[PDB]
């Protein structure tokens, strides 16, 4: 702020931010995973959150510490859930990361460090951290990933792991985070180490630190679990329960006073390079941010009580409120083409939001009832770039985990 | 059967068997496929038959000609259907066949013939023929 | 399968009582569809076991006696079965009365369990089966 | 029920430790909803058996020992239960681990079967519940 070494000031803050989140978890372990066994294929899969309310009450700096609460949902695009991961043993001691919609391959055994790469943002980056199980142990070495695999699996793979996302990371749906978590669930099945959903997400957040994205963290509990989150509570250092539930049930038995909400991209994301800055600029330093943050939390409890009674009409109010509560608030980045899609309609009947990020991606919005379908006719009518302008639903459908079949 | 050139006899029968089935279809065409478009991913999927009855009444030689009948079913293992195929555009003018449970890759643009390979029975062999649109 | 499709294509209308048995496989298929077209589930099961007989004892007698040990027990509880498709490996299915069926699952649960595992797998009729191109 | 609603309305805030126990019934209800609001199904079962205790041993101690013979066996396999609503007749429900539950169905299937029959009846959550005026 004075003048001098902002980049080093950012570096000092960044390293301290990491060190702040470097605390701290069991173990980091040493475990020789075994399970698979050979012939199998382990396939995981996961639905995708949105956050109705309870917005950036996530994302350290929270309140600071403590906590937040988000209550979000965890839902599904038409089929498949998507975000689905395949992982297999092989013959050839080089851990291949293999992607689709981008992926040629990532031939890996070096580690080099491990894995941990914000180095080249081939989202193969995310499976790197998926090898951060610990990902160390006795008494192996760099060549002796030979030992790692070929006593672990033992199953002489150099494991080849093959994800799939359906949607780009310009979703504002936390898809990166969810994806990583799902991989970790597949590992937990895969060759061993026997974990929990929650501690899956714990260790996920732990590596999400070194993933160095701002930890949009609501999602990784959200989209894995089912239609609630709720209660981010402790947030130091950073402690993370947060659980309990809610009926949906007015997202199903369906309303049918519409019987819901659904999608418009016509807009790509910017993507996000200023947003998580304004988050982590700052902590309990500044400003009325901290203020507005606090009643986001309040409005989240508002939310859950509301639909915990079933006030669907007021559910819609609180949705539009959250929209207001971020659009006009932090962060005022929603780019006026979005507002043209808001413009028409705003009308017919009620409110909306951008989930998650904002500044691209896609909304959803609730109406009365079949005037809703006439809104589908409205976006059907105009405002249709080739980022298409759909009904996409959403489709609450959820548990979301894995198979290891057969 | 007499003695002599069973392998050539099998070869003659094999080529005649092919030539018998070489007949014959529209077109083989020329079509410039376009659709995709770019950003998309096309994912296919399929359930798996069994045949309750109506066994090898399939499989030329049938009766010979004609016909058979099988009536079988078309069913599904628990989920996914399985047998599911993803296919995508890219940047890099080499048709990659990519498999899973075996597949490293098959980098292809040669054709060489086309595709058509009973050459190495990497079941990438099957997508070769999948490029036989005509091809 | 390296002998099976040989015995198929050895031969055409050359030989033998194959051609004979082939013909009533077709007949038995029409038998099948009429049967379950009326809903004679019990007789559906008969015709399944018949098809098994109609290929096991018939072309092709390749079903390897470990399969027959899995047949051996049970054969019993209640009714028949087949290997779909190829035979000589892979996996069967079989129909019973009703929950004695689940006790058969307990039977294969009990023994006869190599690491090619010995499951309920279902099957699960569920079907259309095509593609998405989403979105 | 001719004594039960008496003990209810004998009395109001007159007497006794009734009023006491009543109050933590309310407390235990908030216990309940928070419990399954988190999904602690195992603890859901605990609180069910607690409510049973909280009325059986408590107001009202009317549950007639034949009921307790149906409790007797089982109590076991695995977890608790209650009589809904009144008590002193009618019918329970009870939760177990998992298919040991079905073996409990085998247990009540085995014995303890007067002609007020001894069933699985389910229950079956299914609900909105109103009217038609059709058409």
Numbering used by the authors:
A (entry chain A): 544 to 949
B (entry chain C): 544 to 678
C (entry chain C), D (entry chain D): 815 to 949
Q: What does the publication say?
A:
In bacteria and plants, the two independent catalytic reactions in the salvage pathway can be accomplished by a single enzyme, the fucokinase/GDP-fucose pyrophosphorylase (FKP). FKP can convert l-fucose into GDP-fucose via a fucose-1-phosphate (Fuc-1-P) intermediate, and has been applied to the chemical synthesis of fucose-containing glycans and glycoconjugates. Each monomer is composed of an N-terminal GDP-fucose pyrophosphorylase domain, a C-terminal fucokinase domain and a linker in between.
We overexpressed and purified the full-length wild type FKP from Bacteroides fragilis 9343. In the end, we got a cyro-EM structure of the full-length FKP at 4.0 Å resolution with a C1 symmetry. The final structure model contains 810 amino acids, from residue 71 to 398 and 467 to 949. The overall structure of FKP exhibits a tetrameric organization. The tetrameric organization of FKP is mediated mainly by the CTDs. Two interfaces are identified in the structure, with one interface formed by a six-stranded β sheet interaction and the other by a loop-helix interaction. The GDP-fucose pyrophosphorylase domain contains a typical Rossmann fold and a left-handed β-helix fold. The fucokinase domain of FKP, as predicted, adopts a GHMP sugar kinase fold. G76A, R80A, G88A and K89A mutants almost completely lose their GDP-fucose pyrophosphorylase activities. Taken together, it strongly suggests that this loop region is critical to the GDP-fucose pyrophosphorylase activity of FKP and may be the putative GTP binding site during catalysis. For the glycine-rich motifs, result shows that the T602A, G757A and G902A mutants have greatly reduced fucokinase activities, while mutants with R592A, D594A, G597A, G598A, D601A, G758A, G759A, Q761A, D762A, G899A and G901A, respectively, retain hardly any fucokinase activities. This suggests that this large pocket surrounded by the highly conserved residues is a potential substrate-binding site in the fucokinase domain of FKP.
